[PDB]
Write a protein that binds this ligand. Structure first.
Ligand SMILES: C[C@H]1CC[C@H](NC(=O)Cn2ccnc2)CC1
Ligand SMILES: NC(=[NH2+])c1ccc(C(F)(F)F)cc1
Length: 330
């Protein structure tokens, strides 16, 4: 089997991407944030505290003839940005782009933090990291990909995110029309539960490539590119007027600037992020100071190849017996 679904930016800045997902019988379609940096499929629901729902579409398990309460199971997750959610668990039929999993754990939110309530465009998360990170207790649950894998034509999924445009998540096949050149594959460590790999270096604009190992995660659920302070300083030094602002929380730059590209290495291959992809717009409405899309990872404890990086590539999440990652230009 295979599946193919379009993923759409939630706003004009590509702050996140949503993908429609069918849950239950009859289908209830929710727009979920596919997150290769976590492993829970959770949704706003008829159980979510009413004051914490503000425009999201909800899953109502009592209206699904295939929903079953997973007795005694609860979940609770906190993310890197300080947001969180928690609740109970159902199993139900879940379909993405024509690919169906029966018995998928659907984590129903009883509580969500304010940043989830405040984002009416995201109805929940669909985790695509390794199932070892799943938070369900006392019986850990599998991701949608982990449940589908054996049925897929090939044990892979691909992320093809757009810049200010829709893109595609495919399951079970590689669309050879969706990229240029070849796909370069690189080793993955699953020890921290992530799609963790080592980039071979970087360049800023037309500058020379610096060979240096950068260990980080391929994370569709993080907006920005978080890299070591040395690398980030080298990038922003090429932008007149750019500075790190403790009050704003990162590097800012004049909105009048034309940003240089940023290249990252995948083996001997190179992925080029155009400068425009690095512009996250005014820091507050009407400001002429703009927020940068490349930020320091110092104090995160890991580098994060988030959407800014991934959207410049066609990315293969290869879930073969030994997982790997593939990157192609597009
Ligand atoms: N913060 C992030 O990196 C992800 N995100 C989710 C919603 N908007 C952005
Ligand atoms: N769910 C995610 N995509 C995610 C959240 C937090 C972190 C961090 F802790 F490293 F910051 C990494 C990945």
């Amino acid at each position: 089997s295979t599946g193919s679904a379009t993923t759409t930016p939630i706003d004009s800045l590509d702050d996140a991407y949503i993908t429609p997902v069918q849950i239950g019988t009859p289908a209830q379609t929710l727009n979920l944030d596919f997150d290769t940096g976590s492993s829970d499929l959770w949704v706003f629901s008829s159980e979510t505290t009413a004051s914490e729902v503000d425009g999201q579409t909800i899953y109502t398990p009592s209206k699904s003839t295939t929903a079953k309460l997973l007795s005694g199971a609860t979940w609770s997750i906190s993310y890197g940005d300080g947001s969180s959610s928690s609740g109970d668990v159902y199993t139900d039929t879940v379909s993405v782009g024509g690919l169906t999993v029966t018995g998928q754990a659907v984590e129903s939110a009883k509580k969500v933090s304010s940043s989830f309530t405040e984002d009416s465009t995201i109805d929940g998360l669909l985790g695509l990291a390794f199932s070892t990170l799943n938070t369900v207790s006392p019986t850990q649950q599998k991701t949608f990909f982990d449940n589908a894998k054996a049925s897929l034509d090939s044990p892979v999924f691909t992320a093809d995110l757009g810049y200010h445009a829709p893109g595609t998540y495919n399951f079970g096949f590689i669309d050879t029309t969706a990229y240029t050149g070849s796909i370069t594959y690189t080793a993955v460590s699953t020890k921290q539960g992530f799609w963790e790999w080592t980039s071979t270096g970087y360049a800023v604009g037309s500058g020379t490539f610096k060979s240096t190992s950068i260990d980080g995660i391929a994370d569709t659920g993080t907006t920005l590119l978080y890299l070591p302070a040395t690398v980030v300083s080298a990038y922003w030094a090429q932008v007149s007027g750019a500075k790190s602002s403790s009050s704003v929380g990162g590097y800012v730059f004049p909105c009048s600037a034309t940003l240089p590209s940023f290249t990252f290495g995948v083996g001997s291959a190179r992925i080029v992020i155009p400068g425009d992809y690095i512009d996250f717009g005014p820091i507050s409405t009407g400001s002429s100071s703009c927020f940068g899309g490349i930020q320091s990872s110092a104090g995160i404890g890991i580098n994060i190849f988030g959407d800014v990086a991934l959207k410049a590539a066609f990315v293969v999440f290869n879930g073969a017996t030994t997982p790997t990652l593939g990157f192609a230009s597009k």
